Symmetry: C2
Subunit: 48 residues, 2 copies
Amino acid sequence: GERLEEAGGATSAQIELNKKREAEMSKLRRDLEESNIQHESTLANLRK
Amino acid sequence: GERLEEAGGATSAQIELNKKREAEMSKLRRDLEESNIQHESTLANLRK
């Protein structure tokens, strides 16, 4: 009975972190755009 | 006793998935710098 709770814990435990890691992927996906759209501004700035 | 192997079959499936998931997570994490050092060099090469 404890063995279900720990292994069913183990299906619950790792499923939170990779889901949280999936939030980390979508975090850096914004930074790649942020390192583009902010970065394209200075090239538009420095040509002026 | 039926729940024991499916909780084992879930973890043996899911922990199989994360070792390539951390790789593609590492890929975008290893992507931001060669946008950064690229966009710094085009700040550099356009400067002189």
